Symmetry: C3
Subunit: 87 residues, 3 copies
């Protein structure tokens, strides 16, 4: 089991991505209780980073399985495959 | 052996968390010397994130031992166990 | 394969570091296409963190190989080994 953690804002909001058995899942905190997030994608290894544009959070998750990394993008309207390619 | 790194402030401060032998230790930089920090807890995988309220640094460390992740919290006066649970 | 991801600014700029086949390479996004960065060092594990000084980025990459971690520094003018020592 392996995790990546990101946070933003003043509350703050926190996201923790966990890779286990080639699935990555997400736990979220937005100032109250922890809840299971909408992120669900394949991966044995995960890293993540985020930034704010004004009030909007943008997240990028790098999900690696085998020898292959897929970027997954949150920009406010669902998780979408990003343009990242590796070496 | 596996690490996690955070930073904050204009100096900046840096914390590096290392998981080896199912212990996680902490090396710190506050502008001067590297030094071993107050943090340690069990874990063989580690992620971390942090934010400022000014004023005070706040650090969350996610220590995974086997199939369980524990959150450990720095909010300016000691490490305390966080409300995080997994799936 | 294992990755670490950092980002800065509003474009944003992203760097993703990937340890694979016992070496760590870098993929870079500055607002258009992805490209392969100058970071290249030995290691089985990588973590990283960054901060801005105005619009100048500073990156610290912690490359681990065996029971030892080497810190690598970007401060505008190439990569330089940093003062980090482990336990
Ligand atoms: C109290 C409050 O305002 N909470 C906000 C949340 O509702 C936002 O979570 C996102 O909310 C939308 C509906 O508005 C939808 O439910 C999304 O699934 C949910 O997204 C979560 O957070 C994302 C950043 C991703 O991590 C995603 O996988 C999660 O499920 C959040 C985020 O904008 O803001 C809170 O303030
Ligand atoms: C400032 C900011 O966060 N802007 C957001 C863009 O980054 C988002 O994605 C980019 O959208 C264009 C066309 O809409 C194109 O599809 C790019 O590939 C896409 O880039 C993504 O994000 C980059 C940061 C990289 O992660 C790249 O690999 C990704 O593919 C758009 C969503 O359309 O939202 C803006 O708000
Ligand atoms: C100039 C100076 O004193 N530097 C400050 C540090 O000493 C502070 O570190 C904390 O110091 C207290 C002693 O009063 C104690 O030893 C804490 O363990 C130490 O905390 C460190 O930093 C925290 C963020 C955690 O990483 C903790 O585990 C570390 O051990 C720091 C922050 O309190 O401020 C400097 O200015
Ligand atoms: C904005 C900020 O930095 N606030 C700090 C809180 O984050 C710290 O913990 C949270 O404290 C409130 C009680 O005042 C509440 O009890 C939350 O459960 C507690 O949550 C922790 O922190 C969250 C961000 C998550 O990491 C959560 O799982 C943790 O358990 C308090 C410490 O007493 O300090 C505030 O300054
Ligand atoms: C289009 C544009 O102007 N992009 C800039 C990049 O060229 C800069 O990156 C680097 O460029 C120099 C030569 O100009 C050299 O090739 C550097 O190695 C390269 O640095 C990259 O980015 C760094 C932050 C590191 O991640 C490094 O390992 C990378 O290879 C960047 C520098 O920030 O600025 C863009 O605007
Ligand atoms: C912020 C500092 O930058 C350089 O001076 C490094 O040698 C230190 O280890 C630290 O990363």
């Amino acid at each position: 089991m392996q995790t990546a953690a990101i946070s933003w804002g003043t509350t703050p909001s926190i996201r923790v991505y966990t890779a286990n058995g080639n699935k990555i899942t997400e736990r979220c905190y937005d100032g109250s209780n922890w809840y299971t997030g909408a992120f669900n994608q394949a991966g044995d290894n995960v890293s993540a980073t985020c930034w704010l544009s004004g009030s909007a959070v943008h997240i990028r998750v790098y999900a690696t399985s085998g020898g292959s990394t897929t970027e997954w993008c949150w920009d406010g309207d669902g998780w979408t495959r990003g343009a990242y390619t590796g070496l």
